[PDB]
Amino acid sequence: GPETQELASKRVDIQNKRFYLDVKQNAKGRFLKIAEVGAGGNESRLTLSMSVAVEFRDYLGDFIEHYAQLGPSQPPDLASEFLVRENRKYYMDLKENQRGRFLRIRQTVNRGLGSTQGQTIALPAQGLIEFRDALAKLIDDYG
Amino acid sequence: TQELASKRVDIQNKRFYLDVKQNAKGRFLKIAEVGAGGNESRLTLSMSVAVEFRDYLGDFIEHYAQLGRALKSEFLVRENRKYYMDLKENQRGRFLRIRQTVNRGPGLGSTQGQTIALPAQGLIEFRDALAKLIDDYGVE
Ligand SMILES: [Mg+2]
């Protein structure tokens, strides 16, 4: 609320989706919040450390360079996986929905049968370069 | 396949060659660790993964530099490949181990694959060399 202050923000418009890339700050340090605004104003959030954001900028870079090769392999005629794990706990997954022309990104934490849920955005493939450019500009300026 | 550029980083008895190479598919980074009798271990990365690898090294360096949430292990599954990066400690020294395995098809599992082990003292030098070849020869 008044705990976290906002330092900077960028808006990117791709199809009917609006993304806000925010640089924010609290007691715990500086982080990057991505807000996606869908139909009916349904927001989904992705929240990144400044080091995971650097990584994420480059994962987007990888897909931009390699979008078809990293897409889902065609099925068998009648005759892909992109996952990052850190300290065996924190997961980030990126996967193309070919029907949507979307890149789905999920961040989760696993803790045996411990409980936890996580965070998911989907980026139209036609706004990948623009999203990534905006993300990169915020990293250049906000350490 | 053409050798565009190389750099050598010397860390204890080991030497690490970082080479940019070019072929059909695109540019890659060959890393090759040479021990005291010339035994080689080799790692080949696309430039995209080389860039990811640069970022992982910054994180290992933040952990190594800490006095007394910091990256201890990183795993990346990308296409038919897995990469395992483990900041290991023994009493003889701290080092970063990097294992590559590759999936050789359905039902075949994956190859044990070649391993490099980077003494922690040389992470910064190694990262600096990598970053310089990415700047001079990378795309992303
Ligand atoms: Mg993560």
Author numbering:
A (entry chain B): 55 to 133, 145 to 176, 179 to 210
B (entry chain A): 58 to 125, 141 to 212
Sentences from the paper on this structure:
Mutations in the human PURA gene cause the neurodevelopmental PURA syndrome. Based on the crystal structures of PURA from Drosophila melanogaster (dmPURA), three conserved sequence regions termed PUR repeats I, II, and III were identified to fold into globular domains. Whereas PUR repeat I and II assemble into an N-terminal PUR domain via intramolecular interactions, two C-terminal PUR repeats III from different molecules interact with each other and thus mediate dimerization of PURA. All these PUR domains belong to the class of the PC4-like protein family, which mainly bind single-stranded nucleic acids and can unwind double-stranded DNA and RNA.
In contrast, the spectrum for hsPURA I–II K97E indicated a strongly altered secondary structure content. To understand how exactly the surface-exposed K97E mutation alters the domain folding of PURA, we solved the crystal structure of hsPURA I–II K97E. The asymmetric unit of the crystal contained two molecules of hsPURA I–II K97E and showed good overall fold similarity to the hsPURA I–II structure. However, an overlay of both molecules of the K97E-variant protein from the asymmetric unit also revealed unusual differences between them with r.m.s.d. of 1.48 Å for 125 superimposed Cα atoms. More C-terminally, the loop linking β6 and β7 is shorter by two residues, thereby correcting again the sequence register within the next β-strands (β7 and β8). From all the areas of the structure, the β-ridge appears to be structurally the most divergent part. It is surprising that the K97E point mutation, which is located on the β4 strand of the β-ridge, induces the observed unusual change in the β-sheet arrangement without destroying the domain’s overall scaffold. Importantly, all the resonances perturbed upon K97E mutation remained in the presence of 1H-saturation, confirming that the structural rearrangement does not induce protein unfolding. Together, this shows that the K97E mutation does not induce global unfolding of hsPURA I–II, but rather triggers structural rearrangements mostly in the β-strand region. While hsPURA I–II quantitatively bound a 24-mer CGG-repeat RNA, the hsPURA I–II K97E-variant protein showed moderately but significantly decreased RNA binding. With an effect considerably stronger than observed for RNA binding, the hsPURA I–II K97E variant showed a loss of strand-separation activity by 90%.
